[PDB]
C-alpha cells in the first residue's frame, strides 16, 4: 500500500471500500447499509490502477481472482460462459475473496453497437452474475478500465459496479511523493533536488516519473562506463534525462525540437514581458490567484502585418515557458470523412487537457474559425460544425487545469467575431511594424552568432531601413552572408589554383561592410502601405 | 558468411549503440544495474520511413546476441477460430519467458494496434487488450525484452507507448552524406570494383537515397557491367570462359549511368518525366542563370561556410514577367542540370472535390520534399493556387483560403526547415498573396524582362545550335530587326 | 489472381497468402506472378478497412523480412501504379519497374506480322501502310 | 443480375462471380448476360468503396487473364455506357459495343404487328397510320 503514492484521497476511499466489507462486516450490518461489491477505476493509462489493485490485494490479504479482459474467451463450443461462471463460483465458495477484472472494456463492450452474438452472450452472463450479489458471500469486485466512456452502461446499474473513482493526473505534491518513492532504492548523489525536479516535471504523470528516473540512471551508467562502487546519478544527469524525455500522453503530438531563446526574439520587449507574465503568473502565484478571486484569461490572439514575428514569439514561448506546447496548423484539423474533423478537434483538446499546464498554438486561425459568411451556397457543410466545436471547447474549459490557447493569424478580418468574445479568447496583442530601436534589436539578435568585422555599425543600417519588416532584415542579413560566402569561395578557389601552380585559413574571416553595402542594394519593404493601412484601421477600430 | 554482423548496419551508429546497450548490458553486466539499484528499460520501438534498416537491425541483433530470439510477424497472429489469436499470443509469450531470457521481435506492429478507438473489429480489440495485458499487468515480464518495428508510429495505440510497455522509441531515419559513404563501403566490400571507382563522389551526388536505395544503385551498376560484357561473349549456356568471367570490373561510367536512372524510392511516386535541356540551351539570362545556379549549389556543396557564419540560406524564388520569356525553360534547365531532386507540380493539379484533400495533398507533397531533401519544388502559375484571401463572395467552403493558409504554414511554420527550395513561376503576380511574397518564403523576386538586341541574338544562337545552316547566313540582321519580340516569337 | 485471396473468415486471406508463398518456396526456384495488385495494396493509409490493412502488412512481411525470400522472383502487373503503398515500391520488394507503353510504328508492324501469320491473306495487302495509318492503337 | 452478386462480407462477392463463371464453363459452351454493369463497374477511380474495386478487378481477371475464357461468350447491358471502367471496354473483354436504340417508323410498325398478332381487334384499326403517328415512342 505504501508503494503507491500521489493518490491519497482515492487510495483512502478504495482502502475503506475494500477493507470495511472485508475486515469487519459486523459494523456494516450494525449500521445496516451494505457496502458495494463492484468498484470501478477510471483515469489515464499508467496512473496507477494495476499497482493500486495489487497493493490493495497484498495489504488486505484476501483471496484474489484475476480475470484478464481478453483472456475470457475459449475455442471449444460454449466455454467462455462456463469459465466466467466457474471463476465466480470458486471466488465465492473458497473464501471472502476479491475478484479483479483487468481491462473490463475488452469484455463488456456495450449492448448497442456490439455485434458478435457470442460477445453479447458473455456480456449478459457477466451482467447477470454481478446482478446476483449476495452480501453473505463477502466478495467485492474491482474494475480497472482506461476507457471509462466505452463501457456497457448496463454494468453501471445499481447492484453491480456502482462506485466510481476518477484517479486523475497527480499534482505537484503527488509528483514529489512519487519521485521520493521511486528514487529511494537508487543511490542518488548529494546534489539532487527532488523537490526542484518535481516542480519542473510539470506535465509528467505517473509512469513518466519512473521513465525519467530510469533514463537518468542509464545516462549516468553510460557516462561512467565509457570512462564501480563510485556510482551515483547526479542532478545534471537527471536534468539531461528530463530534457530528453517528454510527457507520455503527449508523445504522439511531440513537435520537433527547434531552438529559440528569449534573447533571440529582437524587439517586442514589452509584448514578450506581458506574455511571460500572463503565462507564468497564473502558474506560479496560485496564492495570488486565490486571494484575488479572479479567473485568469485562458486565451490570446496575436494580430499584425506579415513577418512581424508572431510565429517567432510562439516558438519562444514553446521553448522558454515551463509547460507543454502543442502546435496546430489551420487546415491540419480538417478531414475528408464525416465526423472525423470534429473528432480530431475533440481529441486534440482532450490531449491538451489531462496534461496541464499546456499551450495549444493555433497557427493561421483563418483556416479553422474563418468568417462563415456564405451559408446559402452548399459546399462542405462542415465549417460551421468545426467552428461550433472549437467554440464549445474553448468556452467549456474548466477553471482547474489551466490550458492557455494562443492564436495566430495574419489577417484577423476573416476570423469570426464569435471566437473573439470574452471567455473564449479575450486578450488581443497587436505586433506592429518595428521602429528604429526595435530594428536594431532584431538585427543584433539575428547576428549574434555571426562573426563580423570589428568596424561594423549596424545602427546606420537600422537608421536607413525605416519601413522594413523583420523578414526584410533577415533577407538583408542572408544576402550579406551569401555575398561574403561567394567572395570567400572565389578567394579559396584562386588560392587553391595558385598552390596547384594565397589567402590565410579564412580568406574572408568576417562579413565585410562592403559586402553588406552591396547586399542592401536589393532590399525592399515586405508589407505595402495598403496592408499597413488596413492593419492600423483594424487596430484603431478594435 | 551471409550472416549479417553488427557492422552491416551503417549510418545509424547512435541508434545502434542505444539498442546494443539495451539488449546487452542487462545481460552482459547485470551487476552494474543491481549496483545502481533500479532495473533497465525492457521495450524498444523502431520507427522511420521504409528501407532504412529496422529489419536489418533485427537480423543483426538476432545474429549477434546469443540469447533466445522469438519472431512474430504482424498479421500472423490472427486466426479463424473465435478467441484463438489471444491463445496464440499467450503461447508465444509463455514460450519466450519459459525457455530462456529472450528477445521477442514483433515486426509490423502497426497493423495489430489500430488504436482501439477508431477500430471496430472484435477480434482486433481483443488482440490489443491481450497484448496490453501480457506486456503489462500482474506478473508482466521476467527478463524478457520486446523490440517492435513500425513505419507509421502515429497509428500505434497510445497505451502501448507509455513507459513500462515500450520505454524507448528510436528513430531510424534518413542517413546523411557520411551515412551514405558508410553504406556504400558496406555494400561494396564484396563486389570487385575497378580501381578508378570513387565512392566519395557517389555519396556526395546521392541526395536522398536511404539504405535499400543505395543497394539498388549498386545492383544496377553491376547489372549494367554484366550487360556491357555479356555482349562480346556469346550466350554459351554450357560455360562462360574464365577470361571474361574474371577481370570484369565495374567502371565509374556504370555508376554514373545507374545514378542517372535511379531515383529515391520515396520520390518514386512523383518522379518527373525525362527531359533533355541544358544551360547553354537557354539563350540570354546570363545573370539570372548564374544567380540561380549559385543560390542552389551553395547550400548543398558548401555547408561548412554557412555554419561558420551561423546563418541559414535563402530558399525561395519567384520568377515573374510577360508570357513566353523562359520561366518554364529555366525550371526545366534546373531540373535537368542541378543535383537536387526535382518535384514539378502544376498550379491547379493538386485540388480535389472532397473536403480537405487539397491541403492533404499539399502536406504530402511538402512532406515528401523535406523527406528526400535537398529538393527543388516548381510551382507553375502560382496565381492559380495562391490567390488573395476573401476575394470571392461565393466559394466552395473557402477551399482556396484553406489551401493558401496550408501553403503558408508548410513553407514557414513549426518545422525543421532544413533544405527545400521553392521556385514559383507566374506571369501575373498581382493575384499572389502578400504573405507568400514575404521574405522567408519566396524572398527573391526575379523579373525576366524582354530580351534586347544582344539577348535576342543569344537566343537565336541557342535555338539554332542543332540545325544545319547556310554558312553565309548571318543572324545579326534578324536581331537588329526584331525589337519587341519574345523567345516564343 | 488479384482478389482471389480474400475470404470472409477473420485471418484467412493472410493464411492464403502464406500458404501460397510457402508452396512457391518449398518446391523449387519459382516465379510468382500477381495480377492486378491495385486491389490488394490500397496504400494502407487511405483505406479504413482493418482486413485490408492486415492483408497489406502480411504481404509486406512475407515479401521482406527475416529469411524473406530464397530464390523466388516475384512479378506483378498493374494498370495504375501510383495507387500502391510506397513500401512496396522499394528495392527488395519490387526492385525494378518496367514501363510497357504505347508501341511505335515498328512495334505496330511487328504486332501485325505476329497476328497475321496464321490467317490467309491476299497479295494486294501491305502491312507497312496499315502500320503507318494506324496511330493510337495500343496493341 | 447486377446487384445480386455483391455482399457485405469480405471477399464473398468475388466468390459469387467466380462460382458463376466456373459453373458456366464447367457446364457447357454458354452465354452469360450481365445487366446494369454500371452498378458493378464504377471505374475504380470515383469508387471510394473498396469492395467495388475488388469486384471490378475480379471481373477483369475472370474475362481476361491466363486461360481466361473458353467457348463462352458474354453480353452486357448498361443504360450509361460511359459509366464503366475503361479497362473493360478494351478488346478481348467487350470487343463490340452495339447500340439498341430507337427504331425507325418501320420498326414501330414491326413492334405494333408483333404486339397485335396475339390479341384480337376490330377490323377498322389500321396499323400503318398509328405507326406513322408515333415517332418517338420506343418499344
Amino acid at each position: 500500500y505504501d508503494d503507491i503514492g500521489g493518490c491519497r484521497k482515492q487510495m483512502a476511499q478504495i482502502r475503506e471500500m475494500v477493507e470495511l466489507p472485508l475486515r469487519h462486516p459486523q459494523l456494516f450490518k450494525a449500521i445496516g447499509i451494505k457496502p458495494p461489491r463492484g468498484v470501478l477505476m477510471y483515469g489515464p493509462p499508467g496512473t496507477g490502477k494495476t499497482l493500486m489493485a495489487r497493493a490493495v490485494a497484498n495489504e488486505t490479504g484476501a483471496f484474489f481472482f484475476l480475470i484478464n479482459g481478453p483472456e475470457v474467451m475459449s475455442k471449444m463450443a460454449g466455454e467462455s460462459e462456463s469459465n466466467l461462471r466457474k471463476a465466480f463460483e470458486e471466488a465465492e465458495k473458497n473464501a471472502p475473496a476479491i475478484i479483479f477484472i483487468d481491462e473490463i472494456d475488452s469484455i463488456a463492450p456495450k449492448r448497442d453497437k456490439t455485434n458478435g452474438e457470442v460477445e453479447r452472450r458473455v456480456v449478459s452472463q457477466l451482467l447477470t452474475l454481478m446482478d446476483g450479489m449476495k452480501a453473505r458471500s463477502n466478495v467485492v469486485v474491482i474494475a480497472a478500465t482506461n476507457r471509462p466512456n466505452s463501457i456497457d452502461p448496463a454494468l453501471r446499474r445499481f447492484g453491480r459496479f456502482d462506485r466510481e473513482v476518477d484517479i486523475g493526473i497527480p499534482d505537484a505534491t503527488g509528483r514529489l511523493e512519487v519521485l521520493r518513492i521511486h528514487t529511494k532504492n537508487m543511490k542518488l548523489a548529494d546534489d539532487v533536488d527532488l523537490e526542484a525536479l518535481a516542480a519542473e516535471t510539470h506535465g509528467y504523470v505517473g509512469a513518466d516519473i519512473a521513465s525519467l528516473c530510469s533514463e537518468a540512471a542509464m545516462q549516468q551508467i553510460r557516462e561512467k562506463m565509457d570512462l564501480l562502487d563510485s556510482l551515483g546519478v547526479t542532478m545534471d544527469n537527471f536534468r539531461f534525462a528530463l530534457g530528453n524525455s517528454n510527457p507520455s500522453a503527449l508523445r504522439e503530438t511531440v513537435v520537433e525540437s527547434v531552438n529559440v531563446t528569449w534573447d533571440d526574439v529582437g524587439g517586442l520587449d514589452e509584448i514578450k514581458e506581458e506574455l511571460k507574465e500572463t503565462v507564468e503568473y497564473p502558474v506560479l502565484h496560485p496564492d495570488q490567484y486565490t486571494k484575488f478571486g479572479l479567473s485568469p484569461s485562458k486565451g490570446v490572439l496575436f494580430y499584425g502585418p506579415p513577418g512581424t514575428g508572431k510565429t517567432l514569439l510562439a516558438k519562444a514561448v514553446a521553448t522558454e515557458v515551463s509547460a507543454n506546447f502543442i502546435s496546430v496548423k489551420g487546415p491540419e484539423l480538417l478531414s475528408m470523412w464525416y465526423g472525423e474533423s470534429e473528432s480530431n478537434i475533440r481529441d486534440i483538446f482532450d490531449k491538451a487537457r489531462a496534461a496541464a499546464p499546456t499551450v495549444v498554438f493555433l497557427d493561421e486561425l483563418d483556416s479553422i474559425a474563418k468568417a462563415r459568411g456564405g451559408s446559402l451556397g452548399d459546399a462542405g457543410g462542415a465549417s460551421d460544425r468545426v467552428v461550433n466545436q472549437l467554440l464549445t471547447e474553448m468556452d467549456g474549459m474548466n477553471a482547474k487545469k489551466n490550458v492557455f490557447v494562443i492564436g495566430a493569424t495574419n489577417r484577423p478580418d476573416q476570423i469570426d467575431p464569435a471566437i473573439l468574445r470574452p471567455g473564449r479568447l479575450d486578450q488581443l496583442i497587436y505586433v506592429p511594424l518595428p521602429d528604429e530601436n526595435a530594428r536594431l534589436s532584431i538585427l543584433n539578435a539575428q547576428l549574434r552568432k555571426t562573426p563580423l568585422e570589428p568596424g561594423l555599425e549596424l545602427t546606420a543600417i537600422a537608421k536607413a531601413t525605416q519601413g522594413f519588416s523583420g523578414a526584410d532584415l533577415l533577407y538583408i542579413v542572408q544576402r550579406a552572408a551569401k555575398y561574403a560566402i561567394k567572395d570567400s569561395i572565389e578567394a579559396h578557389r584562386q588560392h587553391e589554383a595558385e598552390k596547384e601552380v594565397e589567402p590565410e585559413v579564412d580568406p574572408v574571416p568576417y562579413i565585410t561592410k562592403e559586402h553588406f553595402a552591396e547586399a542592401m542594394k536589393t532590399a525592399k519593404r515586405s508589407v505595402s502601405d495598403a496592408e499597413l493601412r488596413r492593419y492600423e484601421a483594424y487596430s484603431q477600430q478594435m | 558468411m551471409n550472416e549479417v554482423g553488427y557492422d552491416d548496419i551503417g549510418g545509424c551508429r547512435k541508434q545502434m549503440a542505444q539498442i546494443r546497450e539495451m539488449v546487452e548490458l542487462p545481460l552482459r553486466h547485470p551487476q552494474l544495474f543491481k549496483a545502481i539499484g533500479i532495473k533497465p528499460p525492457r521495450g524498444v520501438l523502431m520507427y522511420g520511413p521504409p528501407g532504412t534498416g529496422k529489419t536489418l537491425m533485427a537480423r543483426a541483433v538476432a545474429n549477434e546476441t546469443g540469447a533466445f530470439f522469438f519472431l512474430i510477424n504482424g498479421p500472423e497472429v490472427m486466426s479463424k477460430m473465435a478467441g484463438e489469436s489471444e491463445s496464440n499470443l499467450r503461447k508465444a509469450f509463455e514460450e519466450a519467458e519459459k525457455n530462456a531470457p529472450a528477445i521477442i521481435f514483433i515486426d509490423e506492429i502497426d497493423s495489430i494496434a489500430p488504436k482501439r478507438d477508431k477500430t471496430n473489429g472484435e477480434v482486433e480489440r481483443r488482440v490489443v487488450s491481450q497484448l496490453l495485458t501480457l506486456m503489462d499487468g500482474m506478473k508482466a515480464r521476467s527478463n524478457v525484452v520486446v523490440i517492435a518495428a513500425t513505419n507509421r508510429p502515429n497509428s500505434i495505440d497510445p497505451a502501448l507507448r507509455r513507459f513500462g510497455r515500450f520505454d524507448r522509441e528510436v528513430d531510424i531515419g534518413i542517413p546523411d552524406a557520411t551515412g551514405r559513404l558508410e553504406v556504400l563501403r558496406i555494400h561494396t566490400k564484396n563486389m570487385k570494383l575497378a580501381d578508378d571507382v570513387d565512392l566519395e563522389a557517389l555519396a556526395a551526388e546521392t541526395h536522398g537515397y536511404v539504405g535499400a536505395d543505395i543497394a539498388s544503385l549498386c545492383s544496377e551498376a553491376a547489372m549494367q557491367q554484366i550487360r556491357e560484357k555479356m555482349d562480346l561473349i556469346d550466350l554459351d549456356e554450357d560455360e562462360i570462359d574464365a577470361e571474361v568471367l574474371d577481370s570484369l570490373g565495374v567502371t565509374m561510367d556504370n555508376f554514373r549511368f545507374a545514378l542517372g536512372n535511379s531515383n529515391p524510392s520515396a520520390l518514386r511516386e512523383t518522379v518527373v518525366e525525362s527531359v533533355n535541356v541544358t544551360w547553354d540551351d537557354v539563350g540570354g539570362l546570363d545573370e539570372i542563370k548564374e544567380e540561380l545556379k549559385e543560390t542552389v549549389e551553395y547550400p548543398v556543396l558548401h555547408p561548412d561556410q554557412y555554419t561558420k557564419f551561423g546563418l541559414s540560406p535563402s530558399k525561395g524564388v519567384l520568377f515573374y514577367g510577360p508570357p513566353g520569356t523562359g520561366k518554364t525553360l529555366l525550371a526545366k534547365a534546373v531540373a535537368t542540370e542541378v543535383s537536387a531532386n526535382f518535384i514539378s507540380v502544376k498550379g491547379p493539379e493538386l485540388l480535389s472535390m472532397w473536403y480537405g484533400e487539397s491541403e492533404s495533398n499539399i502536406r504530402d507533397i511538402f512532406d515528401k520534399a523535406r523527406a528526400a531533401a535537398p529538393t527543388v519544388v516548381f510551382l507553375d502559375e502560382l496565381d492559380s493556387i495562391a490567390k488573395a484571401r476573401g476575394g470571392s463572395l461565393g466559394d466552395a467552403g473557402g477551399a482556396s483560403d484553406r489551401v493558401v493558409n496550408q501553403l503558408l504554414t508548410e513553407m514557414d511554420g513549426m518545422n525543421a526547415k532544413k533544405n527545400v527550395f521553392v521556385i514559383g513561376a507566374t506571369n501575373r503576380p498581382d493575384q499572389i498573396d502578400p504573405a507568400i511574397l514575404r521574405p522567408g518564403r519566396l524572398d527573391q523576386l526575379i523579373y525576366v524582362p524582354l530580351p534586347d538586341e544582344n539577348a535576342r541574338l543569344s537566343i537565336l544562337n541557342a535555338q539554332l545550335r542543332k540545325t544545319p545552316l547556310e554558312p553565309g547566313l548571318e543572324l545579326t540582321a534578324i536581331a537588329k530587326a526584331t525589337q519587341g519580340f519574345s523567345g516564343a516569337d | 489472381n488479384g482478389p482471389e485471396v480474400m475470404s470472409k473468415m477473420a485471418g484467412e486471406s493472410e493464411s492464403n497468402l502464406r500458404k501460397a508463398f510457402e508452396e512457391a518456396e518449398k518446391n523449387a526456384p519459382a516465379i510468382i506472378f500477381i495480377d492486378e495488385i491495385d486491389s490488394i495494396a490500397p496504400k494502407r493509409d487511405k483505406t479504413n478497412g482493418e482486413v485490408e490493412r492486415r492483408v497489406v502488412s502480411q504481404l509486406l512481411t512475407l515479401m521482406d523480412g527475416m529469411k524473406a525470400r530464397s530464390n523466388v522472383v516475384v512479378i506483378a502487373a498493374t494498370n495504375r501504379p501510383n495507387s500502391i503503398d510506397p513500401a512496396l515500391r522499394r528495392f527488395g520488394r519490387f526492385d525494378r519497374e518496367v514501363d510497357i507503353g504505347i508501341p511505335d510504328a515498328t512495334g505496330r508492324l511487328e504486332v501485325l506480322r505476329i497476328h497475321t501469320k496464321n490467317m490467309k491473306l491476299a497479295d494486294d495487302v501491305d502491312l507497312e501502310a496499315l502500320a503507318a495509318e494506324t496511330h493510337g492503337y495500343v496493341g | 443480375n447486377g446487384p445480386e452478386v455483391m455482399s457485405k462480407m469480405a471477399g464473398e462477392s468475388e466468390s459469387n462471380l467466380r462460382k458463376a463463371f466456373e459453373e458456366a464453363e464447367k457446364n457447357a459452351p454458354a452465354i452469360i448476360f450481365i445487366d446494369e454493369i454500371d452498378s458493378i463497374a464504377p471505374k475504380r477511380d470515383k469508387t471510394n468503396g473498396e469492395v467495388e474495386r475488388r469486384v471490378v478487378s475480379q471481373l477483369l481477371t475472370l474475362m481476361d487473364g491466363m486461360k481466361a475464357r473458353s467457348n463462352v461468350v458474354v453480353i452486357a447491358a448498361t443504360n450509361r455506357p460511359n459509366s464503366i471502367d475503361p479497362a473493360l471496354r478494351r478488346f478481348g473483354r467487350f470487343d463490340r459495343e452495339v447500340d439498341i436504340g430507337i427504331p425507325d417508323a418501320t420498326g414501330r410498325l414491326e413492334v405494333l404487328r408483333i404486339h397485335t398478332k396475339n390479341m384480337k381487334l376490330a377490323d377498322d384499326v389500321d396499323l400503318e397510320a398509328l405507326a406513322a403517328e408515333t415517332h418517338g415512342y420506343v418499344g
Binding site: - | V123, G397 | - | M9
Partner: peptide
C-alpha cells in the same frame, strides 16, 4: 465450436461544391 468473422461495410464522405453568384 463457434467462430468469428471479419467484415468491413462502408463509411461516409462529405464532398464540396463550387457555386456561381450573380
Amino acid at each position: 465450436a463457434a467462430a468469428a468473422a471479419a467484415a468491413a461495410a462502408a463509411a461516409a464522405a462529405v464532398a464540396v461544391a463550387v457555386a456561381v453568384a450573380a
